[PDB]
């Protein structure tokens with residue numbers, strides 16, 4: 875139970891080892907302006923995504939960070955967001971936990 879793959883297609887995305895406690899916890903439950911609730915797990919690093927558009931600071935859940943939508947690079951499923959432009963760390967990923975599948979390396 876140590877790597878996270880895309881739930882829809884199996885693309886390798888991240889590792890348990892790369893979980894990042896932002897503000898004291900790797901899990902953040904949040905809502906967007908359309909009222910969709912996401913349970914976000916923060917990772918310092920990820921792979922197999924495709925980051926879309928240019929970063930935006932609008933409604934950022936994490937102070938001082940701008941976001942870009944992160945899709946699965948294989949299937950296009952929306953897996954979370956890349957955050958940049960902040961400090962300690964400058965960048966990280968916030969991935970939607972129920973859109974990933976955890977399993978053996």
Ligand SMILES: O=C1CCCC(=O)N1
Nearest residue numbers: 906907933934935941
């Ligand atoms: O409200 C939102 C949607 C996109 C990601 C974020 O930080 N905030």
Ligand SMILES: [Zn+2]
Nearest residue numbers: 880883946949
């Ligand atoms: Zn996928």
